[PDB]
Amino acid sequence: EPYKVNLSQDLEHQLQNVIQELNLEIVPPPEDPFLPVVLNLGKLAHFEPSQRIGVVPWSPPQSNWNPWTSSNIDEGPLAYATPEQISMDLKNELMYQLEQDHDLQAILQERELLPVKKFESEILEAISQNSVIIIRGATGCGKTTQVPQFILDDFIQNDRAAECNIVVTQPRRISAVSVAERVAYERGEEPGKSCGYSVRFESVLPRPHASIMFCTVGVLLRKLEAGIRGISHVIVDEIHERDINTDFLLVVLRDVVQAYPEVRIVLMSATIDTSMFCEYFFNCPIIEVYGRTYPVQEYFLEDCIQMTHFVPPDANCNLICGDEYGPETRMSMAQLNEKETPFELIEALLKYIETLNVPGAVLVFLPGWNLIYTMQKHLEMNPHFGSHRYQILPLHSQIPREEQRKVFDPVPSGVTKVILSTNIAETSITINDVVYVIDSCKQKVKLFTAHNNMTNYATVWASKTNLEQRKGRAGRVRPGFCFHLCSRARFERLETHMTPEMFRTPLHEIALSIKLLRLGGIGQFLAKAIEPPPLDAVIEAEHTLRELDALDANDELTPLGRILAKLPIEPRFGKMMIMGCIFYVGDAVCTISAATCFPEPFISEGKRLGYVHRNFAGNRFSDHVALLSVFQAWDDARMGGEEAEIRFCEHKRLNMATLRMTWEAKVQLKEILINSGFPEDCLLTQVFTNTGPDNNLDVVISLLAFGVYPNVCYHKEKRKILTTEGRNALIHKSSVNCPFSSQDMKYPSPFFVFGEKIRTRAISAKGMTLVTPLQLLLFASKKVQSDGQIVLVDDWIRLQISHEAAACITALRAAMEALVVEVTKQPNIISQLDPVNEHMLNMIRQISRPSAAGINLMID
């Protein structure tokens, strides 16, 4: 039914007077109430379109240049020091370290036994003679940790240390950091000397000479605006993962290596068909790397049920079982849901592994942290799996690096190490005690569908290549056992390979990177990829960027697009942050934005929020206000020094690591807006109240509606909400807006904007913030139609509201867009806006108020 909006007569008129002063078109009302007219003003201001394939330039290392900071070395000995001097000094330093440090000699002795060591000479010849090589070999040979070292030490030992600066790309944040720490440790160092790392919002720079930067590809791409300056070698690691940014970088690097053949590219791959990569890079050589494998006995779901005598409480391949297996096996398998992972069978399998009386670690492949937590809980219930007999360790990207390194530690005699792992343990790391693999046969992939703005953290079937790779992890120390939890018939219906990310990932961020780097057309450049993305993804990226006014009608980068290109967040949040700067609430909007890059700081364990966490929300029915209020309290507690911070965080059940990384990310976002010319004064920390009148916070909530659009919903009763699609959905358990018990919430408005629309067995809105009907019209709606008493918003909900208010508010939206265009041309103008534009912003400030829509959040 149409929702009744109670806005005052004075507000009606003030809106009309601002639209008067903007000399703007109040789209008049229809004659026939069944001829509904579109209120949506077209664009009221544009960027002067520009005229319409570039190569990223390359230059080699040189002694007076810091390639990591992209700046001349002017202070210190290294400003004038000769390459010969630098090389002699680094060589002398290294030989002396090696002859003095006994713990270091011992570590080198371990290095010299890695399978890859035998191929050191062959690898180094191939690189010295070819612009591009591929190093191919089984996971655990030592490609990742040793090859960057082999190259550096080659230069150091041959008196040319100064001529060597290596970029190593990794498809994951966790790999870039872990490998940097591991390689530093192998060289008797911490990151910051010969090794360093750069990931989104965190870096430890290496020394400028004879050094290795481990990064994520996203970092190297954002740093390319000035070219690859002072680097001898780009090692692209784990190319077989088909991480989308790695696929993208291979396009860039192939044009680099064609134009600048003195550069060295080294691609490194697990044992897959690398023909594609070889052919792509002008039939470059492939260096085979190998060492001792062992046979691994493979079993499937039928073999597992039979040999454990286990009994449980697309077509279904658990009803298919051959006649060489007994009837209780078939009857038991046929009771298992293929969409579930049988946690109880995994327990039974661990117990069967005991009876073999061959000691070794068990690696369990589980798709996400949810099934690792679920497995871990289930085990730590049964006292059989206590400290006396078992060390059960989780391995996922989000647990702290102290805990992640424990998977490599050895375990007391008579205790069995069990690793409950994501696919990090498939090809990117090697745990050395492993004799037994239990394989869920599933992957976790983020699927996004634009048409309905639906996110699905999907549990999908692994590939045969994934099952073969997972089986290989059992056969590094002795003959091993791999227990696949899929039926033999399910295995026959598995794809050979996962879909590459390039085929199933939104491309608007890569599109911005192509345009910032002057590489040509989005379509044109992506057509040269090794396996190009689907057309509809390209069209969808171009549509997103034009709608944001990041591209002009000639598909060229606007001054707005150039700032969004530089901000390492979702473009829509980038634009939200520019709007925050204009309203002088930049700090708060940079915090909302930074927080989307990290897990929730609330340690809530998948249950409904308790009293302490709900309290951070005040009277705003907003997960985002809760998050801003946590940061304000945390930042106050931190005045008391580290231990006061630790105590505040564990007394409030907060993840301190997440609050610190989010804070660092906010500081970096603010720096980029500063260097784009936004004044310091629009980005200051602003104390606020989450209970009393606060116009700064009202504007932040208006801008959050813009940021998360089109995620709007309407509350019916209890946890039931109506989505943009006219569809029924649930309030996420996580939300301060989820009813703790049977007490139903009394929302002063039924409208919510939210961070994520999530598909599981149902549709969920996670990260929910109540907005007024005025904020809906202003920033949480594209198309609005009026019959003259009733408005239809994006074809999914109706408001009973003045035709004049609705059209006046839609015009404010259009007026606000035009100012954003003008502000991005010259950001310092926000200091000194002409009066009509201040009145426009004051009107948005006013209709952001709860009072503006007849709401008082202090009276329930």
Ligand X SMILES: CS(=O)(=O)Nc1cc(Br)cc(NC(=O)c2cc(-c3ccccc3)cs2)c1
Binding site for Mg ion (CB under 5 A): 143-144
140/367 with CB nearer Cl ion:
140
Residues 60-79 that bind ligand X (CB under 6 A): 67-70
140/218 with CB nearer ligand ADP:
140
Which of ligand X, ligand ADP, Mg ion, none sits in contact with 333, Cβ below 5 to 8 A by type? none
Which of Cl ion, ligand ADP, Mg ion, none sits in contact with 432, Cβ below 5 to 8 A by type? ligand ADP
Q: Which whole-number Å values give the CA distances from 429 to 171, 312, 422, 789, in the listed order?
A: 13, 33, 11, 63
- Dihedral sign for Cα atoms in the order 818, 819, 824, 829: positive
- Give yes or no for residue 472 binding Cl ion (CB under 5 A): no
Which of ligand X, Mg ion, ligand ADP, none sits in contact with 229, Cβ below 5 to 8 A by type? ligand X
Which stretch, 229-237, 289-297, 531-539, 776-784, contacts ligand X (CB under 6 A)? 229-237
214/616 with CB nearer ligand ADP:
214
Separation of alpha carbons 711 and 796, rounded Å: 12
Three-class DSSP category at 119 = helix
- Give yes or no for residue 142 binding Cl ion (CB under 5 A): no
> Strands, E, within 771-837: which ranges?
784-786, 790-793, 797-800
- Give yes or no for residue 215 binding ligand X (CB under 6 A): yes
Q: Which whole-number Å values give the CA distances from 339 to 174, 343, 459, in the listed order?
A: 29, 12, 8
Separation of alpha carbons 859 and 689, rounded Å: 16
- Supply the minimum distance, in Å, between the C-beta of residue 188 and Mg ion: 22
Which of ligand X, Cl ion, Mg ion, none sits in contact with 68, Cβ below 5 to 8 A by type? ligand X
- Supply the minimum distance, in Å, between the C-beta of residue 186 and ligand ADP: 8
Which stretch, 224-232, 374-382, 416-424, 595-603, contacts ligand X (CB under 6 A)? 224-232
**β-strands 286-289, 264-269 pairing:** unpaired
- Dihedral sign for Cα atoms in the order 704, 709, 714, 717: negative
> Which residues are CB-contacts of 26 (< 8 A; sequence separation ≥ 6)?
16, 19, 804, 807, 808, 811
Q: Which whole-number Å values give the CA distances from 693 to 7, 729, 840, in the listed order?
A: 18, 31, 21
Binding residue for ligand X, selected from 219, 253, 564, 590, defined by CB under 6 A: 219
Separation of alpha carbons 240 and 520, rounded Å: 27
List residues bridging with 790 in a β-sheet: 800
Nearest residue relative to ligand X (C-beta):
198
Binding residue for Cl ion, selected from 111, 172, 497, 653, defined by CB under 5 A: 497
792 phi/psi in degrees, rounded to 5: -110, 115
- Give yes or no for residue 223 binding ligand X (CB under 6 A): yes
- Supply the minimum distance, in Å, between the C-beta of residue 323 and ligand X: 58
- Supply the minimum distance, in Å, between the C-beta of residue 497 and Cl ion: 5
Separation of alpha carbons 392 and 654, rounded Å: 24
Quick one: DSSP state of residue 71? E
> Which residues are CB-contacts of 400 (< 8 A; sequence separation ≥ 6)?
657
230/850 with CB nearer ligand X:
230
Q: Which residue has the tokens 């057509």?
A: 527
Which of ligand ADP, ligand X, Cl ion, none sits in contact with 848, Cβ below 5 to 8 A by type? none
Which of Mg ion, ligand X, Cl ion, none sits in contact with 61, Cβ below 5 to 8 A by type? none
Binding residue for ligand X, selected from 228, 438, 557, 560, defined by CB under 6 A: 228
C-beta of residue 737 within 8 angstroms of C-beta of residue 621: yes
Which of Mg ion, Cl ion, ligand X, none sits in contact with 813, Cβ below 5 to 8 A by type? none
- Supply the minimum distance, in Å, between the C-beta of residue 102 and ligand ADP: 19
- Give yes or no for residue 126 binding Cl ion (CB under 5 A): no
- Supply the minimum distance, in Å, between the C-beta of residue 468 and ligand ADP: 15
Quick one: DSSP state of residue 620? S
Three-class DSSP category at 411 = coil
CA dihedral 708, 709, 715, 719 (to 10 degrees): -40
Separation of alpha carbons 234 and 250, rounded Å: 11
- Supply the minimum distance, in Å, between the C-beta of residue 111 and ligand ADP: 9
Which of ligand ADP, Cl ion, ligand X, none sits in contact with 405, Cβ below 5 to 8 A by type? ligand ADP
H/E stretch holding 541 reads: helix 535-547
CA dihedral 311, 313, 315, 319 (to 10 degrees): 30
Nearest residue relative to Cl ion (C-beta):
140
Q: Which residue has the tokens 């033999």?
A: 488
> What mask of x and - would describe binding to ligand X in positions 178 to 207, judged by CB under 6 A?
--------------------x----x----
Residue type, 366: L
Separation of alpha carbons 738 and 553, rounded Å: 43
- Supply the minimum distance, in Å, between the C-beta of residue 295 and Cl ion: 14
Which stretch, 222-230, 506-514, 814-822, 834-842, contacts ligand X (CB under 6 A)? 222-230
DSSP string, 376-387: HHHHHHSGGGST
Which stretch, 53-61, 133-141, 192-200, 619-627, contacts Cl ion (CB under 5 A)? 133-141
Which tokens hold the place of 132? 């591009």
Which stretch, 203-211, 369-377, 442-450, 494-502, contacts Cl ion (CB under 5 A)? 494-502
Which stretch, 1-9, 140-148, 431-439, 669-677, contacts Cl ion (CB under 5 A)? 140-148
146/655 with CB nearer ligand ADP:
146
Residue type, 578: I
144/341 with CB nearer ligand ADP:
144
C-beta of residue 220 within 8 angstroms of C-beta of residue 237: no
Which stretch, 3-11, 220-228, 310-318, 453-461, contacts ligand X (CB under 6 A)? 220-228
> Which residues are CB-contacts of 462 (< 8 A; sequence separation ≥ 6)?
365, 439, 440, 441, 442, 443, 470, 494, 498
Three-class DSSP category at 323 = coil
Size of the site for ligand X (CB under 6 A): 17
85/145 with CB nearer ligand ADP:
145
214/754 with CB nearer ligand X:
214
- Supply the minimum distance, in Å, between the C-beta of residue 360 and Cl ion: 15
> Strands, E, within 182-263: which ranges?
195-199, 202-204, 211-216, 228-229, 233-236
- Supply the minimum distance, in Å, between the C-beta of residue 408 and ligand ADP: 3
Which of ligand X, Cl ion, ligand ADP, none sits in contact with 408, Cβ below 5 to 8 A by type? ligand ADP
- Dihedral sign for Cα atoms in the order 531, 534, 539, 541: negative
C-beta of residue 486 within 8 angstroms of C-beta of residue 492: no
- Supply the minimum distance, in Å, between the C-beta of residue 211 and ligand X: 11
Which stretch, 41-49, 93-101, 137-145, 705-713, contacts Cl ion (CB under 5 A)? 137-145
Q: Which whole-number Å values give the CA distances from 634 to 533, 654, 758, in the listed order?
A: 43, 9, 29
- Supply the minimum distance, in Å, between the C-beta of residue 181 and ligand X: 16
- Give yes or no for residue 551 binding ligand X (CB under 6 A): no
Which of ligand X, Mg ion, Cl ion, none sits in contact with 780, Cβ below 5 to 8 A by type? none
Residues 155-174 that bind ligand X (CB under 6 A): 167
456 phi/psi in degrees, rounded to 5: -125, 105
Binding site for ligand ADP (CB under 6 A): 114, 139-146, 182, 405, 408, 430, 432
202/787 with CB nearer ligand X:
202
- Give yes or no for residue 382 binding ligand X (CB under 6 A): no
Quick one: DSSP state of residue 654? B
Which residues does the chain break after (C to N > 2.5 Å)?
Answer: 52, 313
Q: Which residues bind Cl ion (CB under 5 A)?
A: 138, 140, 497
Contacts with ligand X, residue ranges (CB under 6 A): 67-70, 167, 198, 203, 213, 215, 219-220, 223-224, 228-231
